[PDB]
Design an enzyme around this catalytic site. Structure first.
Site, PDB file in Angstrom:
ATOM      1  CG  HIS B  41      -0.676   0.182   2.546  1.00  0.00           C
ATOM      2  ND1 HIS B  41      -0.179   1.490   2.773  1.00  0.00           N
ATOM      3  CD2 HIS B  41      -0.644  -0.427   3.616  1.00  0.00           C
ATOM      4  CE1 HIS B  41       0.068   1.102   4.211  1.00  0.00           C
ATOM      5  NE2 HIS B  41      -0.101   0.137   4.778  1.00  0.00           N
ATOM      6  N   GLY B 143       2.241   5.956  10.165  1.00  0.00           N
ATOM      7  CA  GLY B 143       3.826   6.089   9.915  1.00  0.00           C
ATOM      8  C   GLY B 143       4.340   4.721  10.355  1.00  0.00           C
ATOM      9  CB  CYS B 145       2.357   0.831   7.565  1.00  0.00           C
ATOM     10  SG  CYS B 145       0.684   1.555   7.739  1.00  0.00           S
TER      11      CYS B 145
END
Ligand SMILES: CN(CC#N)S(=O)(=O)N1Cc2ccc(Cl)cc2[C@H](C(=O)Nc2cncc3ccccc23)C1
Ligand SMILES: CN(CC#N)S(=O)(=O)N1Cc2ccc(Cl)cc2[C@H](C(=O)Nc2cncc3ccccc23)C1
Ligand SMILES: [Cl-]
EC number: 3.4.19.12
Lengths: 296, 305
Positions: B41, B143, B145
């Site tokens: 993503h 942030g 991820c």
């Protein structure tokens, strides 16, 4: 979202852990520059020390035997001069912490790190750690920017299962001595400023059932808190909670009224941040840091 | 003595954390050898998240659109490929700090350490478990991820989780390191919700054996139970079924403490019925389910008190 008991990343400390052997005793040492720091009980301590030579201390860093070229004592810590500087020495300071302050512990056995956990210096100067035989010399620390602040070195376990140790200058936290004698932890108290910080963290994460319309004076709050074995709340604690008070819109004395109601009436089948007890091992700074994402 | 929620030392993982930037999105990557692994993503906009066609978004990208930063050094991306929900960025430099590692897919109830990172920099380490509903109750902000979950039994790092998203209840979802999601989740901003969660029964039993090892027996009783009667009671408190595998796995702790698994099951049934009555077990007023039988054996002493 979420709120966990979080430790600092341990890598900078892992590269300093060594094994120290003297006769039959094996424990952990902290190798910084060309000196290995470890509990002096590895060996009147001056009479025991004068009988030892440099070669009696076996120091092992990974699969490499370091050569001890000198030795000296500073309070309850032994400083072993070695012939090799640790190439992995981080930027560091030795700092002495106050009760109620938190730190990360890198628990080690045979100079090898096994786990990392977060804990607080209790008001009775003990720590509720998780240590087995061989863990002596394991260290406590905080990280501020790229600098490791070493604040604790593990020395012993008391009869109630709690732990005692020193700062890195060898001064004990608490009225303890490094010998096999009748020692006991004093009656402990709850770190009030930390419980308040944890209640602000719960509000930030959406847990607001305990909030009420009431406020209190600092004097009335302390009269109530003394009855439940809670540490007195000072104006400094109120000042330190200022930022969290402004973020959530709940005045410190407003949150004290919530804490008073929780102490007098309990939680009533409810939890706060997944806990049925009031948590006191997160400082106001830990709450701000975890709810802001500060990195190292 | 003592019993803490203990994480593995994070050093071996810290030396693998990098920052990955694609357009306006910045998240974390895991740099192992000459490959950087990160959530796919990273190539999406927030608009794209409703119904992203990752294959269509990826074909439009070139190697130089991916910016990878390791410390204060820019790594050069020389190839890219997608594997399930993970993007694998081939880089021109092998990580000299790559530890001995494996990619392992874990089962619900298993525990692991999480190194939470922001902008490729580690901020904290905590211990957690894969819930029965395949979510994790982590502590993650925007942030985070690409942050990873791992175990380090001996000197080999077993990577088991990569962080992808936060669900509406504040819980977290992610994938194994081959990009397969745990649970029925997708890397889409679709109406997704965690299923009803349950308590990890085999872990609560392990934690009750840890309490006995550390010197506490107040909760024991003179009763036993059949496995079927225990499960009939346990299901009523939203506890996971206890299987014969779980009973087999608790064998070592049963032999160390002298308390049969079905006798410990009888004590658990009574705790669910009565509560703790002002008492605690290992410093907790709730029954703890995020320590496995393996974690208890690893942390606790081999001599019962
Ligand atoms: C009865 N003792 C402590 C206990 N129980 S002992 O084992 O005889 N012990 C005596 C003693 C005295 C002074 C000093 Cl400074 C250190 C020690 C040692 C000590 O405290 N070691 C330990 C540290 N941390 C966790 C430990 C868990 C288990 C055992 C030992 C641990 C060794
Ligand atoms: C409503 N969202 C999540 C929330 N609340 S979002 O921020 O719009 N988000 C949508 C979304 C959907 C699917 C996938 Cl695979 C990733 C994401 C992103 C996401 O989940 N990011 C975050 C991860 N982990 C903790 C996060 C805490 C706070 C914010 C964001 C976090 C971005
Ligand atoms: Cl597993």
């Amino acid at each position: 979202s979420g709120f966990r008991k979080m430790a600092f990343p341990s890598g900078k400390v892992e590269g300093c852990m060594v094994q120290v052997t003297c006769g039959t005793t094996t424990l952990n040492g902290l190798w910084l520059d060309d000196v290995v720091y470890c509990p002096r009980h590895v060996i009147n301590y001056e009479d025991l020390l004068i009988r030892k030579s440099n070669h009696n201390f076996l120091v092992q860093a990974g699969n490499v035997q370091l050569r001890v070229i000198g030795h000296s004592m500073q309070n309850c810590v032994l400083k072993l001069k070695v012939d090799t500087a640790n190439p992995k020495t981080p930027k560091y300071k030795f700092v002495r912490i106050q009760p109620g302050q938190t730190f990360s512990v890198l628990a080690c056995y045979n100079g090898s790190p096994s786990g990392v956990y977060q804990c607080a210096m209790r008001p009775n100067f003990t720590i509720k750690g998780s240590f087995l035989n061989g863990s002596c010399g394991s260290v406590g620390f905080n990280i501020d920017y790229d600098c490791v602040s070493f604040c604790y070195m593990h020395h012993m376990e008391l009869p109630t299962g709690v732990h005692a140790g020193t700062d890195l200058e060898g001064n004990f936290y608490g009225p303890f001595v490094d010998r096999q004698t009748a020692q006991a932890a004093g009656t402990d108290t709850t770190i009030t400023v930390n419980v308040l910080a944890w209640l602000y963290a719960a509000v930030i994460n959406g847990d607001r059932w305990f909030l009420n319309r009431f406020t209190t004076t600092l004097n009335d709050f302390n009269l109530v808190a003394m009855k439940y074995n809670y540490e007195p709340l000072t104006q400094d604690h109120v000042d330190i909670l200022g930022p969290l008070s402004a973020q959530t819109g709940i005045a410190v004395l407003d949150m004290c009224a919530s804490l008073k109601e929780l102490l007098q009436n309990g939680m009533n089948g409810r939890t706060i941040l997944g806990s049925a007890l009031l948590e006191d091992e997160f400082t106001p700074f830990d709450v701000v840091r975890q709810c802001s994402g500060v990195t190292f």
